Amino acid sequence: LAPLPPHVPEHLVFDFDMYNPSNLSAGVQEAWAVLQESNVPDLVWTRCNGGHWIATRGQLIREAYEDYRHFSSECPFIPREAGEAYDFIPTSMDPPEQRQFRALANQVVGMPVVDKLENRIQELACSLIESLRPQGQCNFTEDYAEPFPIRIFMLLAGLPEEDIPHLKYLTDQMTRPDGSMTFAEAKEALYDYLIPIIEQRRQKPGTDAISIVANGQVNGRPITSDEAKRMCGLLLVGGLDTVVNFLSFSMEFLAKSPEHRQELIQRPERIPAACEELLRRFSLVADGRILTSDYEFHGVQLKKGDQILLPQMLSGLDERENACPMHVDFSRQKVSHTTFGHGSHLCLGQHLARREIIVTLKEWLTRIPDFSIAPGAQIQHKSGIVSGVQALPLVWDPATTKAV
Amino acid sequence: SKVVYVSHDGTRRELDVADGVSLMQAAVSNGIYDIVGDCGGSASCATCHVYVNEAFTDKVPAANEREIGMLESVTAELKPNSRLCCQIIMTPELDGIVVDVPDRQW
Ligand code: HEM
Ligand SMILES: CC1(C)[C@@H]2CC[C@@]1(C)C(=O)C2
Ligand code: FES
């Protein structure tokens, strides 16, 4: 615990650790939801990880992400040292400037690239699942959650798949560090891998995403090698550690709820409505901002330099935003959430993410309509900037499956 | 209700949008030209800029404080009938509305 700073009153302290919450065994979304129990105030201060504020309700999280004049994105991670080293390029910036870099990133992960990859995304999902179908079992995190969305990104970035276990390790140290590397060491190692690839693609520019970013223009002028490196680094983390974790939270729920599996098998056109409800119940991102100056927010005095974690996963789980928030209802009339962010930094790859989630649910239930958690297995989750599942062993009778 | 999107090159696309749907969601969900809708429709960007046909501007409820601010940064020419279509929710009173889309959003 870091020593309580003198402008923070003792009654706002709640020592919640975002990298290892106390109720992680009941589920990481359940672990973060303890901040929303009756006895916890809307804005608390935790002495864990250096000490920082935590907005626990959606009203406060949405309001803070909208006001970038008070809450800046210059320092968004929470060991005060990872936020200071963080410098990817449509995120570590406040928006007069940040806006010109979002158009270039949209060219490589927005809808126009989802349309270019539509055939390969559908083919890989069907190929990976048909190969597992006759086994009757599989380690979902290593057999599909990682290879499906990581192989599509390596194809989109023109990188060889043999580099996945080196990159997937660096990206995971920036969101769920195991202690061997600081955020700065992992970020510099990721830049070391991209530097020589960006210069080669600037000399011979091709069709992959790194070639388009390295040779792209922002508001009429050509991007520098440094800006291209800071943007490519962010695309690699988004392509290797976001949908990979969400696919496991969703399949773990379907495996534990055969009534929800039946609802999508009987009416497959409800899958994209179900995908949004799963994005709300199993939200998994939680970064934040730093105060640009002293400011009273909801009765609490914040001090310039203070870090406040605005966890996107908490807005959709707030009961004031959705009644019975822990229950999954594919027919929920108003599915409100900030899973893809809020304000000017809204996720630019949410269209590629929704497509990978919807194609996985439709093609998996078509070949393997019935599956369950391996008997005796207790699923364990992990917390950090992006939460995830350590392992998800599934089993099913291959007599109930069908090859397309 | 009917909604027509005229593109920069002069192409015309007609959709049947249900109530509660914003013109941005209808355009992006039907691959309509140039409209990006990057911020998601929360009036925090200007890539969903369109020119509402002069005959329907008084049938739509004016832009709020957030849209007026974002309209000050549109890349295409700013007209007095310019609107971020993600703020226009479709109703059966707007049936037949026509909006021109400028080929420059980013
Ligand atoms: C389930 C999947 C995903 C979730 C939950 C998610 C969540 C988020 C969130 C919460 C933010 C805002 C962060 C902030 O405001 O500090 C964000 C931004 C971003 N995400 Fe996604 N993301 C997902 C998938 C992806 C993918 C597949 C990519 C592809 C690279 C990606 C690329 C980006 C980019 C480039 C930004 C930065 C926008 C900016 O800062 O202007 N994301 N994402
Ligand atoms: C918080 C995020 C999910 C968002 C995209 C990847 C991520 C880890 C960032 O650094 C920005
Ligand atoms: S989609 Fe961003 S302002 Fe309309």
> Per-domain residue ranges for chain B?
1-106
Q: How far apart are CA B94 and CA A212, in angstroms?
A: 40
Cα A312-A315-A320 angle, rounded to 5 deg: 175
Chain A residues in contact with B41 by the CB 8 A cut-off are none
Mutation for testing the B interface, residue in A111, A115, A223 having most B CBs under 10 Å: A111
- Tokens representing B102 are 């400028």
Q: How many helices (H) and strands (E) does chain A have?
A: 17, 14
Q: How far apart are CA A229 and CA A224, in angstroms?
A: 9
Q: How far apart are CA A297 and CA A299, in angstroms?
A: 6
Q: How far apart are CA A69 and CA A366, in angstroms?
A: 48
Other beta carbons within 10 angstroms of residue A257's beta carbon come to 12
Kind and range of the H or E run holding A52: strand A52-55
Domain A1-404 maps to which CATH number in 1.10.630.10, 3.90.550.10, 3.40.50.300, 2.40.170.20?
1.10.630.10
The residue type found at A98 is Q
| d(CA B66, nearest CA chain A) in Å | 10
Ligand 2 and A175: CB distance under 6 A: yes
Residues 6+ positions from B66 with CB-CB distance below 8 Å: B42, B43, B44
Q: Tell me if A30 sits within 8 A of A23, measured CB to CB.
A: yes
Other beta carbons within 10 angstroms of residue A123's beta carbon come to 10
Q: Tell me if A194 sits within 8 A of A232, measured CB to CB.
A: yes
| d(CA A355, nearest CA chain B) in Å | 13
Q: Tell me if A198 sits within 8 A of A228, measured CB to CB.
A: yes
Yes or no, beta carbons of B36 and A106 under 8 Å apart? yes
Strands A137-139, A43-46: pairing kind: unpaired
Ligand nearest to the CA of B39: 3
Q: How many helices (H) and strands (E) does chain B have?
A: 2, 5
Q: Tell me if B64 sits within 8 A of B43, measured CB to CB.
A: yes
Strands B49-52, B82-84: pairing kind: antiparallel
Phi/psi-derived region of residue A324, left when phi > 0, alpha when psi is between -120 and 50, beta in every other case: left
Chain A residues in contact with B47 by the CB 8 A cut-off are 103
The SS3 call for residue B13 is strand
Q: Tell me if A132 sits within 8 A of A144, measured CB to CB.
A: yes
- Give the distance from CA B42 to its chain's centroid: 13
Yes or no, beta carbons of A99 and B45 under 8 Å apart? yes
Q: How far is the CA of A194 from the CAs of A43, A184, A275, in angstroms? A: 39, 15, 33
Chain A residues in contact with B38 by the CB 8 A cut-off are 102, 106, 110, 346, 348
Q: Tell me if A51 sits within 8 A of A344, measured CB to CB.
A: no
| Structure determination method | NMR
DSSP-based helix, strand, coil % in chain B, nearest 5 = 20, 20, 60
Ligand nearest to the CA of A152: 1
Residue whose token pair is 């002028």:
A221
Q: How far is the CA of A258 from the CAs of A217, A249, A263, A369, A372, in angstroms? A: 50, 15, 9, 9, 8
B49-52 sheet: strands from edge to edge: B12-16, B2-6, B97-100, B49-52, B82-84
Q: How far apart are CA A259 and CA A275, in angstroms?
A: 16
Chain A residues in contact with B86 by the CB 8 A cut-off are none
Residues 6+ positions from A192 with CB-CB distance below 8 Å: none
Which residue, B9, B89, B73, is CA-closest to A102? Answer: B73
Q: Quick one: which atom of ligand 3 is closest to the CA of B37?
A: 1
Q: How far apart are CA A237 and CA A180, in angstroms?
A: 18
Q: Is B85 annotated as a binding residue?
A: no
Other beta carbons within 10 angstroms of residue A28's beta carbon come to 26
Other beta carbons within 10 angstroms of residue B89's beta carbon come to 16
Residue whose token pair is 């009534």:
A259
Which residue, A53, A51, A40, A33, is CA-closest to A11? Answer: A40
Please provide the CATH number assigned to the domain covering B1-106: 3.10.20.30
Cβ < 6 A, ligand 1 pocket: A 73, 76, 90-91, 98, 102, 105, 109, 234-235, 238-239, 242-243, 246, 285, 287, 312, 339-341, 345, 347-349, 352-353
What spacing in Å lies between the alpha carbon of A43 and ligand 2's midpoint?
A: 23
**Per-residue exposure over A91-107, b if at least 16 CB sit within 10 Å of its own CB, e if not:** bbbbbeebbbbbbbbbe
The DSSP annotation for A178-235 comes to -SSS-HHHHHHHHHHHHHHHHHHHHHS--SSHHHHHHT-EETTEEPPHHHHHHHHHHH
Ligand nearest to the CA of A108: 1
Residues 6+ positions from A296 with CB-CB distance below 8 Å: A302
Q: How far apart are CA A91 and CA A200, in angstroms?
A: 26
Q: Which chain B residues have any C-beta within 8 angstroms of a chain A C-beta?
A: 28, 31, 36, 38-40, 42, 44-45, 47, 73, 105-106
Q: Is B48 annotated as a binding residue?
A: yes
**Domain spans in chain A, listed from the N-terminal domain onward:** 1-404
Q: Tell me if B86 sits within 8 A of B37, measured CB to CB.
A: yes
